[PDB]
Design a binder for this molecule. Structure first.
Ligand SMILES: Nc1ncnc2[nH]cnc12
Length: 246
């Protein structure tokens, strides 16, 4: 289980929470020195539980699928809430079985459906650690419109920060002030499967990508990633989505 408490949270303890989250995800192989996540894990062993405590010390417990870092649902007080999709429903068989009631959220867990329900695209939703604090507080008292925007903050400050060191950095910069994500953060979020597939395919091709991935960089310009020598590969991506699961 990993745990983060926002009271006392500073860029450094956050950096540490994100290092422990990565560290808690099982892998048997490293492809180009990046952890390759497992193709499947069975049952209960498929879910990591994160305890998040907001500044006032209230907690929600989020269940994450360890094969692809997907947030499946969460428990607030005595109620579990799960995304409306098959994988979240399978997850309910193993986690939060102690909750007095189980509520299925009107939407599934991907960004398209969540932005529709929340009302804004995520490039207009400020993220940071004050926004994570706010998100926890929202999720404690059900409201499904408000839960959609809070869950967009929650995904980006935990699962997306574990996947890319750049997003973790970005959230460390927003430790005392929220700010909308750069377009580089949106691009990276959207490319994880692609990037993961081509680094794994690069293995039998001299570290060269069979199809290059285009990203927006820091300075907002289009940039083609073509082999594993790239800074995106050497420094930025931290966990690889197994090809079996793409
Ligand atoms: N529900 C989710 N959990 C983690 N990463 C995601 N990316 C998009 N939706 C996500």
């Amino acid at each position: 289980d990993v745990s983060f408490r926002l009271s006392g949270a500073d860029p450094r303890s956050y950096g540490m929470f994100i290092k422990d989250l990565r560290n808690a995800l099982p892998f048997r192989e490293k492809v180009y020195n990046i952890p390759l996540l497992l193709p499947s894990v069975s049952g209960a062993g498929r879910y990591l539980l994160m305890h998040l405590f907001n500044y006032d010390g209230k907690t929600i417990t989020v269940a994450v699928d360890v094969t692809n870092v997907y947030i499946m649902g969460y428990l607030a007080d005595t109620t579990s809430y799960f995304f409306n999709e098959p994988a979240a429903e399978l997850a309910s068989q193993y986690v939060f079985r102690d909750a007095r009631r189980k509520i299925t959220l009107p939407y599934s867990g991907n960004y398209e459906r969540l932005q529709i329900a929340a009302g804004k695209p995520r490039e207009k939703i400020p993220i940071g650690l004050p926004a994570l604090d706010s998100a926890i507080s929202t999720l404690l008292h059900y409201d499904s419109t408000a839960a959609a925007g809070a869950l967009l903050v929650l995904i980006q400050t935990t699962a997306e920060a574990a996947r890319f060191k750049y997003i973790e950095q970005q959230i460390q910069e927003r430790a005392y002030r929220d700010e909308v994500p750069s377009l580089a953060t949106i691009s990276l979020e959207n490319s994880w499967s692609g990037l993961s597939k081509q680094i794994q395919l690069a293995q039998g091709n001299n570290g060269i990508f069979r199809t290059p991935i285009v990203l927006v960089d820091n300075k907002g310009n289009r940039v083609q990633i073509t082999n594993v020598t790239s800074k995106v590969v050497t420094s930025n991506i931290q966990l690889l989505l197994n090809t079996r699961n793409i």
